[PDB]
Design a protein around this ligand. Structure first.
Ligand SMILES: [Cl-]
Ligand code: NA
Length: 129
């Protein structure tokens, strides 16, 4: 599923991400835009052989099991394919574990390079939330 901007903002809000660990909703919408272009089916392979999955491009080296990332952890305890669903629940629950891990949203490279320090409230402007 390819989400609309306000559709995704409302789904993330319902799942508890608005101000989760201090990060306003706009941060999460901005990250999803630049990680996956709001497409739950996005996948991208990394040089180390790991793969990034779903709307928030969660990585198989640490967070999910895809059966082909040797010596990986599965810290969200899920198959990576569960992160590609049109229901974002699994992605959100895993993201909450990631952002609690110590370096906050800097774990998402696109967030650090394209959202951090910008006017992220713009990503929820106009939405009925
Ligand atoms: Cl933080
Ligand atoms: Na893994």
């Amino acid at each position: 599923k390819v989400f609309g901007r306000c559709e995704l903002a409302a789904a993330m809000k319902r799942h508890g991400l608005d101000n989760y660990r201090g990060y306003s909703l706009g941060n999460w919408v901005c990250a999803a835009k630049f990680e996956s272009n709001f497409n739950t089916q996005a996948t991208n392979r990394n040089t180390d052989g790991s793969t990034d999955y779903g709307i928030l491009q969660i990585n198989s080296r640490w967070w999910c099991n895809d059966g082909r990332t040797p010596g990986s952890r599965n810290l969200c305890n899920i198959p990576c394919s569960a992160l590609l669903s049109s229901d974002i629940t699994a992605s959100v629950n895993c993201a909450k574990k990631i952002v609690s891990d110590g370096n906050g949203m800097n774990a998402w490279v696109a967030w650090r390079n394209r959202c951090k320090g910008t006017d992220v409230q713009a990503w929820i402007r106009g939405c009925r939330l």
